[PDB]
Design an enzyme around this catalytic site. Structure first.
Site, PDB file in Angstrom:
ATOM      1  N   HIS C  55     -14.238  11.176  -2.244  1.00  0.00           N
ATOM      2  CA  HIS C  55     -15.550  11.012  -1.361  1.00  0.00           C
ATOM      3  C   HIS C  55     -16.553  12.616  -2.390  1.00  0.00           C
ATOM      4  O   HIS C  55     -18.069  11.849  -1.936  1.00  0.00           O
ATOM      5  CB  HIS C  55     -16.450  10.215  -0.220  1.00  0.00           C
ATOM      6  N   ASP C  85      -8.943   8.139   0.195  1.00  0.00           N
ATOM      7  CA  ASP C  85      -9.726   9.602  -0.008  1.00  0.00           C
ATOM      8  C   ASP C  85      -9.597  11.145  -0.308  1.00  0.00           C
ATOM      9  O   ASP C  85     -10.373  11.854  -0.413  1.00  0.00           O
ATOM     10  CB  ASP C  85     -10.688   9.281   1.041  1.00  0.00           C
ATOM     11  N   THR C 143      -2.704   1.515   5.109  1.00  0.00           N
ATOM     12  CA  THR C 143      -3.058   0.840   5.977  1.00  0.00           C
ATOM     13  C   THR C 143      -4.066   0.476   7.458  1.00  0.00           C
ATOM     14  O   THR C 143      -5.069  -0.433   7.401  1.00  0.00           O
ATOM     15  CB  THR C 143      -1.728   1.436   7.550  1.00  0.00           C
ATOM     16  N   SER C 160     -14.744  17.701   5.017  1.00  0.00           N
ATOM     17  CA  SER C 160     -14.044  16.319   3.992  1.00  0.00           C
ATOM     18  C   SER C 160     -13.322  18.100   3.728  1.00  0.00           C
ATOM     19  O   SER C 160     -14.259  18.852   2.486  1.00  0.00           O
ATOM     20  CB  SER C 160     -14.812  15.962   3.759  1.00  0.00           C
ATOM     21  N   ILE C 218       3.987  -6.141  -3.821  1.00  0.00           N
ATOM     22  CA  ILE C 218       4.756  -6.780  -3.202  1.00  0.00           C
ATOM     23  C   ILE C 218       3.700  -7.975  -3.332  1.00  0.00           C
ATOM     24  O   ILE C 218       3.724  -9.516  -3.774  1.00  0.00           O
ATOM     25  CB  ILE C 218       5.108  -7.177  -2.147  1.00  0.00           C
ATOM     26  N   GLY C 219       2.925  -8.329  -2.215  1.00  0.00           N
ATOM     27  CA  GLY C 219       2.498  -9.003  -2.400  1.00  0.00           C
ATOM     28  C   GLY C 219       3.235 -10.254  -0.561  1.00  0.00           C
ATOM     29  O   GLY C 219       3.208 -11.588  -1.456  1.00  0.00           O
ATOM     30  N   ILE C 220       2.453  -9.477   0.003  1.00  0.00           N
ATOM     31  CA  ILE C 220       3.363 -10.968   1.372  1.00  0.00           C
ATOM     32  C   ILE C 220       2.554 -10.000   2.983  1.00  0.00           C
ATOM     33  O   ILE C 220       1.844  -8.908   2.761  1.00  0.00           O
ATOM     34  CB  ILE C 220       4.768 -10.053   1.164  1.00  0.00           C
ATOM     35  N   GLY C 221       3.158 -10.855   3.805  1.00  0.00           N
ATOM     36  CA  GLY C 221       2.147  -9.659   5.474  1.00  0.00           C
ATOM     37  C   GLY C 221       3.361 -10.581   6.249  1.00  0.00           C
ATOM     38  O   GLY C 221       4.440 -10.532   6.016  1.00  0.00           O
ATOM     39  N   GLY C 222       2.853 -10.302   7.293  1.00  0.00           N
ATOM     40  CA  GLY C 222       3.867 -10.547   9.009  1.00  0.00           C
ATOM     41  C   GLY C 222       3.353 -10.016   9.892  1.00  0.00           C
ATOM     42  O   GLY C 222       2.578  -9.684  10.288  1.00  0.00           O
ATOM     43  N   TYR C 289      -0.395  -2.866  -8.106  1.00  0.00           N
ATOM     44  CA  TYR C 289      -1.443  -2.356  -7.104  1.00  0.00           C
ATOM     45  C   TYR C 289      -2.938  -3.207  -7.611  1.00  0.00           C
ATOM     46  O   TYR C 289      -2.844  -2.348  -8.857  1.00  0.00           O
ATOM     47  CB  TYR C 289      -1.347  -2.289  -5.835  1.00  0.00           C
TER      48      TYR C 289
END
Lengths: 291, 291, 291
Positions: C55, C85, C143, C160, C218-222, C289
């Site tokens: 940034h 960033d 995250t 920064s 990957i494309g998942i959660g939980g 990604y």
């Protein structure tokens, strides 16, 4: 070498500060327990007594306490006090509880490095360091937000109830609030307050043995000890004393200062009676502070 | 063990910082001495001289000084200076006065732990710690609010005139934080300024010997030493010098830098005359800085 | 004695922090290089690589880097990453460059004294001290602004890219700095963030070897490891895996936690394939990604 650090303090005390959650039922239309507020709390002893700010648990239909070790408990409110914003909770823990280091023999000093453990903005447990900028009194008599402990440690919204401990992990006080001022022009950076540990202690014990802190009222003012404006009518009026004089002995000991005197009257259970000097010893019956 | 603490410094220097109250007569219609403002100040020596910020005592009909020991005094303004916001008061203390530790041999360093003693928001004396983030110059020539001492120690309103001391209690500077703090879009944390003690010393002494700090004016600019815009019309124009050249020797010594050069001219009493070099030695008579 | 001080750390690491200037051409009508923005940066090694915040250099027509020794350079943007960033510049320095101390063996601890070196509000290099209030993860998986490093050291606008170092000068992290407020009522005092040095390292190396940080998607959660909302339709769909189950082994090792698992998939280059377990081992090809 080794980096300079206060981690030892963190290790010794952090495990004892908790997240206190104030959950109300009538927060939503489906009347379920919602997180109306939240703050921090210090587990005081292994019986399950936790100290915290009253303004955190006020009007809470439920109170949940959660430990850094993951254990979650429902807390029973054993009592609060407005004049200090301290509240005493009680979880019923089986299995052992972590407890905040306390050193009743230690005397806090202006300048002592001190860390503030708490959970501001509910980001999880955070530590911040500063020093003690003013010590304040450990008396039981309410004076204001100036006879507290003052620290430049960062006290954010969520540090209320947390712990202010010195480098050895010893509990110096319970964080109460920041100074945000009353107005603006600016913001008050680095001016936070904590109730001295010594006092949080006294208050807790009382909140336990009585469900409320019972203070001895004598309604008088001043600056021996000047009796300037003694027109409350409560106990003053009712039994000797004048609207302008000088007292010699609060009960049966010197009346050197006004502050140190009130701090005694308050530690006198209601109904009792004591001999008040000015040499015309006039006895008076102690009442109980106003709501 | 023993808690990490800077209390020693607090014990050695706190007693010397004072509450300075600016009282005006025409503050109310009943024209009585009202507390128009207030700040802090440092008792410099046993003669009773106290340093402080100008902006604190400006237009004060009266000036009251109060010690942490309780003693209160009426203060005589002996002088001030805009280019540094420093002011020298003087209380007439018989009986002895506490004095801020000074160590002229000590050289301040970026990173030194330092405490700021003062009375912000009039809460009573408060200490706050930080480090020196930038040192600044001890010159007598005004440059701006960047050649001061910079500290992340918490400087709030009421810290003006207070002391900024290192871990040993040694006076590092006089707190002065001036107002440029803000940008746009968010408040500036931990960025305060103090006038190097070495300079507060120089300035005070002059304020004593003359009631005002007399600076030697030249009337030039630049970047040997570049003489960029040299069209003040002051003594520069009146006696040799051009609107674009390079000087060799301010008086009879090297003209290496522009800053270190001006800092000399100012330390030259008016009326005097000195040989300016560039090899066409053209003499010039020094005047006195503008109002 | 000697004044308490963190100067050693300053000497050891300040020289390596640089002023990064973002200059755009279309900032004015005369289309010249104007300083659209500015921040700080850390010279990572003697090849001339410098870390900083994306940034800061975004849409920069030019980038100038300046050292505390005075040397100025034109920098080549070798890459950036949004999920952190972090940006990597490269000055081509002949004659030698100062480098930020790094001790990959050192493990940061909550409570470690730490200083922030940077150039906020463009007042020139400034140092501020605080402690680490929370450590955060060194994983490559994004995250949020919570798995960073958290410090009460004063991080202002212009910090920064700066460095956050412990008392020994060791690089603890790269100051990022979350915009604090996002709403009002009060201001988050003493809550600053920095990207763990351990991760800034991993990211820089990637920004170098690829010009962009390639993450394995990957494309998942939980929440074995719960697979709660595995409806992203990426590689998760395309070859086994359901919209509600429990995995056993990310590739050929335990799937104990969800965080530590994702942190692995990202470190797996596209096109590759790995055996996913849950005991019906179903293989899947890793993609890249999303933008």
């Amino acid at each position: 070498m080794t980096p300079a650090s206060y981690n030892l303090a963190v290790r010794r005390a952090a495990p004892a500060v908790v997240n206190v959650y104030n959950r109300g039922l009538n927060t939503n239309s489906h009347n379920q327990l919602e997180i109306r507020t939240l703050g921090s709390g210090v587990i005081m002893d292994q019986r399950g007594y936790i100290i915290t700010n009253k303004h955190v648990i006020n009007d809470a239909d439920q109170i949940i306490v959660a430990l850094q070790d993951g254990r979650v408990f429902e807390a029973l409110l054993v009592g609060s006090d407005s004049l200090t914003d301290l509240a005493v909770l009680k979880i019923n823990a089986t299995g052992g509880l972590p407890t905040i280091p306390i050193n009743a023999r230690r005397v806090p000093h202006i300048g002592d490095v001190v860390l503030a453990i708490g959970n501001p903005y509910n980001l999880g447990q955070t530590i911040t360091q500063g020093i003690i900028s003013a010590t304040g009194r450990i008396g039981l008599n309410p004076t204001g937000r100036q006879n507290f402990l003052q620290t430049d440690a960062s006290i954010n919204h969520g540090n209320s109830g947390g712990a202010l401990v010195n480098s050895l992990g010893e509990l110096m006080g319970i964080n109460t609030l920041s100074f945000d001022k009353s107005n603006d022009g600016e913001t008050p950076e680095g001016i936070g307050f904590a109730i001295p540990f010594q006092l949080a202690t006294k208050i807790m014990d009382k909140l336990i043995r009585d469900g409320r802190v019972i203070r001895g009222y004598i309604g008088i003012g001043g600056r021996g000890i000047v009796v300037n404006e003694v027109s409350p009518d409560g106990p003053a009026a009712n039994a000797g004393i004048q609207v302008n004089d000088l007292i010699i002995s609060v009960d049966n000991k010197p009346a050197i200062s006004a502050l140190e005197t009130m701090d005694q009257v308050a530690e006198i259970r209601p109904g009792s009676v004591i001999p008040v000097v000015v040499q015309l010893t006039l006895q008076v019956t102690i009442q109980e502070y106003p709501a």
